[PDB]
């Protein structure tokens, strides 16, 4: 395992990114909340938002805009559910 955090995307104990996801203090709470499993989900909405807003991935404006969707999510309105599976991995 990488780090030691409680995957908020499910409600268990998974491995955290152990690194700053974005420039700012917010990321500090993202890597300490997200897990190696929930990470895959973060990428999902990432695209949906980029296409739903037509942001510029090339620029940080696309990453700074999504940061508001991750914070207000759990760190904000607060939403947690029990689901998901634990598939295999490689490398």
From Swiss-Prot:
One of the GO biological process terms: cellular response to oxidative stress
SUPFAM superfamilies hit by this protein: YggX-like
Top-level taxon of the source organism: Bacteria
Xref: Gene3D superfamilies: Fe(II) trafficking protein YggX
Cellular component terms per the entry's GO annotation: cytosol
Keyword Coiled coil assigned: no
Keyword field: Iron
A single GO molecular function term of this UniProt record: iron ion binding
InterPro entries named in the record: Fe_traffick_prot_YggX, Fe_traffick_prot_YggX_sf
Similarity comment: Belongs to the Fe(2+)-trafficking protein family.
Function, in words: Could be a mediator in iron transactions between iron acquisition and iron-requiring processes, such as synthesis and/or repair of Fe-S clusters in biosynthetic enzymes.
Name of the protein in question: Probable Fe(2+)-trafficking protein
Organism of origin: Burkholderia pseudomallei (strain 1710b)
């Amino acid at each position: 395992m990488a780090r030691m955090i409680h995957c908020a995307k499910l409600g268990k104990e998974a491995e955290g990114l152990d690194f700053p996801p974005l420039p700012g203090e917010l990321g500090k709470r993202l890597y300490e909340s997200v897990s190696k499993q929930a990470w895959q989900d973060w990428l999902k909405q990432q695209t949906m938002l980029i296409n739903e807003n037509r942001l510029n991935m090339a620029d940080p404006r696309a990453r700074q805009y999504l940061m508001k969707q991750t914070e207000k999510y759990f760190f904000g309105e607060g939403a947690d559910q029990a689901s998901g599976y634990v598939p295999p991995a490689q490398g």
